[PDB]
Each structure stands twice: as C-alpha cells, then as structure tokens.
Design a protein around this ligand. Structure first.
Ligand SMILES: OC[C@H]1O[C@H](O[C@@H]2[C@@H](O[C@@H]3[C@H](O)[C@H](O)O[C@H](CO)[C@H]3O)O[C@H](CO)[C@@H](O)[C@@H]2O)[C@@H](O)[C@@H](O)[C@@H]1O
Ligand SMILES: [Ca+2]
Length: 241
C-alpha cells in the first residue's frame, strides 16, 4: 500500500538489490544526482536495475533544473521502457524506444512555435516512432502542459500516475504542497516488466539537470475478472485503447 524501495532513488543513492546504474555525464553526490552539468553537449542517465511488475503505480520525482535569458536547455526525460542504459539523442537516451516517456523540455527547438516553455509532455512508443527533437516532439505527443519548473527558489516535484489505461502527470512547483493538473489521458496501454529511469541532455545550450529523488508508490487497485488472464508482460505499448 506504499513505497517500493527497490524502485526508488533516494539519497545517499547507495541502494543495493546496486538498484540504479548511471552512464554518460552523470555523477552522484550526497544531495542529488546530477545528470548533466551546465556545460555544452552533455548526456547522462540513471536507470533502475530491477524491472517493475506493478500494473498500478505512481512515481514521485523531486527534480531540479537550474542555470545561468532564453538560452538554456535541453531538459529531462523520465522513462518507463523495455530497454535501459542505452544512450541516445532523446534527452540522453535511445530513440525508437518501447514504452513511456515524460519530457521536461526547457528549449523551444521549433523556431516559430506559439508554445510557452518549459513544456511537459508524454509520448508512448512501440519502437515505430522517432522523437523529432527539432519540433519539440509535438507530432508524437499525446498531451502536455506548460510548466514553470526552472530556476525556482524552492523544491519542484512531479507526479506520474499510471493505472487501468489512465496516465496522469501532475506538478507541485509553487511551494503550496498541492498537486496541479498537467496531463490526464486514457486508452494508454503499457506492459509490466519495464524499467524506470531518468536522463537529460544539453546541446549548444546547457543547464544543470538534477534528480533529488524518485519515489515509486504501489497503488491498491481492483481489476476486472477478464483482465487477469492476460500476460501483462507481453502487452505491446499502445494508444487509443
Ligand atoms: O542545446 C540547444 C540545441 O543546440 C543545438 O541547436 C542549435 C541551436 O542554435 C541556437 C539558436 O540559433 C538560438 O537562437 O541561439 C542559440 C545560442 O545563442 C543557438 O545555439 O538551436 C537551434 C534550434 O533552434 C539549432 O538549429 C542549432 O543547431 C543542437 O544540438 C540541438 O539539438 C539542441 O537542442
Ligand atoms: Ca526542445
């Protein structure tokens, strides 16, 4: 009914099953995991070692993006995918992934966009989609919200809930200890047996991308008779039911 330690990244980040592995620019310190420094052309990631077999879960992420007018980037991505620790151009991680991505995009690559950044969005992939970095992934996203999470003078949190086809992302960015709406969609199909992870990238523009904690909660949810005769591990990630 509560916190799943084996799927949580918690300081001092010395968890042992080694519960998380890192690669690229990633460093561990006693107060945060820094995926990238504020230097150009960096890619870094951290990935849960144990595959998650919960159908119904909620991941809380305490993260921090910060640096030195409109000239910073590129953002963080939070993952729940079949493959782990594979570097790539998608905020540090492979493209054509299988599963779920939540992008915390801080830089408008699309030069004539009406969209206010930073922008949070979700993308579900069965390996057949490419993330168009140059268009901020707009043509492959399912939903998104504008989110003011960068350079705040207090803690910034995100909640990603997934249960029974329903994917919710909510924010806590204004120090009011309240969740605010961002994303709420249905007909999302994902398998169990995927891995949680997080990554960030910087290009010609940079920023510190830090994860302070990821806390995975197991939700107590009733399912239908029929639902339980599925091999939930072989479901193909899918959208629109
Ligand atoms: O990290 C950001 C970005 O870096 C590279 O993209 C280049 C960048 O060029 C910008 C842009 O022209 C802006 O007006 O000024 C910036 C500094 O003053 C400059 O670096 O962004 C453009 C997209 O708008 C690209 O066409 C440039 O090549 C790449 O590595 C990107 O992947 C990365 O997103
Ligand atoms: Ca972008």
């Amino acid at each position: 009914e509560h916190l799943k330690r084996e799927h949580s990244l918690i300081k001092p980040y010395q968890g042992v099953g080694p519960l998380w592995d890192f690669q690229g620019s990633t460093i561990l310190t006693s107060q945060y995991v820094r995926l990238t420094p504020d230097e150009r052309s960096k890619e870094g990631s951290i990935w849960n070692h144990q595959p998650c077999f919960l159908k119904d879960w909620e991941m809380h992420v305490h993260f921090k993006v910060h640096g030195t007018k409109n000239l910073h980037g590129d953002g963080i991505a939070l993952w729940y995918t079949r493959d782990r620790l594979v570097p790539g151009p998608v905020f540090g991680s492979k493209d054509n992934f299988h599963g779920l991505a939540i992008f915390l995009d801080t830089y408008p690559n699309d030069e004539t966009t009406e969209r206010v950044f930073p922008y949070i969005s979700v993308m579900v992939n069965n390996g057949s989609l490419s993330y168009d970095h140059s268009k901020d992934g707009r043509w492959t996203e399912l939903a998104g919200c504008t989110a003011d999470f960068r350079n705040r003078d207090h803690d910034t949190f995100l909640a990603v809930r997934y249960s029974r086809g329903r994917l919710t992302v909510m924010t806590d960015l204004e120090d009011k200890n309240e969740w605010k709406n961002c994303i709420d969609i249905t007909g999302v199909r994902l398998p169990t047996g995927y891995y949680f992870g997080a990554s960030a990238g910087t290009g010609d523009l940079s920023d510190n991308h830090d994860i302070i904690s990821m806390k995975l909660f197991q939700l107590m949810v009733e399912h239908t008779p029929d639902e339980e005769n599925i091999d939930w591990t072989k479901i193909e990630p899918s959208v629109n039911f």
